[PDB]
Ligand SMILES: O=C(O)/C(S)=C/c1c(F)ccc(F)c1F
Ligand SMILES: [Zn+2]
């Protein structure tokens with residue numbers, strides 16, 4: 001697939017189909033680069049992102065790269081939980097007039113932790129349409145965090161698992177300070193029950209996979 005990088009290599013976009021790309025950014029933490037993934041949706045009414053990035057500098061540069069390439073503005077972002085990889089660029093979004101969608105719980109947690117607040121407009125199931133691009137958001141229950149949601153593209157059967165879903169390279173659950181490891185299995189089961197025919201699964205970190213990433217996450221939770 002087509003892969004396009006910034007000069008530093010810290011931001012990359014990879015094409016999944018004509019209108020759907022994965023964005024990946026490296027956040028540097030004590031000398032260790034840590035990548036994280038979101039989506040870029042190229043719609044007839046603008047660009048929509050699933051997730052920002054670790055901080056405002058990276059978010060600014062991601063927006064600028066995609067607006068230049070796709071020749072449209074970023075209009076909306078969906079924030080999938082209130083950790084820095086997802087929400088760290090919220091100040092940039094607000095000051096540019098980019099709408100930052102989230103559940104109410106994600107917005108409360110953002111505020112509790114000193115971030116600017118997203119809209120708190122998403123429910124347990126929300127169906128959005130941007131141009132011709134359909135987007136469903138789903139709260140499956142607690143897992144990696146109490147608030148994590150997934151994003152589904154029904155025209156492509158693409159699931160953005162976010163940090164609820166571990167990549168094949170993840171050999172443990174990672175940081176579980178804010179996680180609910182009992183509920184996590186049930187939450188993944190709720191995803192597997194809702195979306196029974198999945199073409200790709202985008203984890204929060206690591207390589208794109210398929211429903212096997214869900215099953216891998218269930219095994220890590222044993
Ligand atoms: O494993 C992950 O998906 C994530 S988001 C871990 C994590 C976290 F628990 C707290 C803060 C943060 F900045 C993080 F990156
Ligand atoms: Zn997280």
Ligand SMILES: [Zn+2]
Nearest residue numbers: 085163204205
């Ligand atoms: Zn994460």
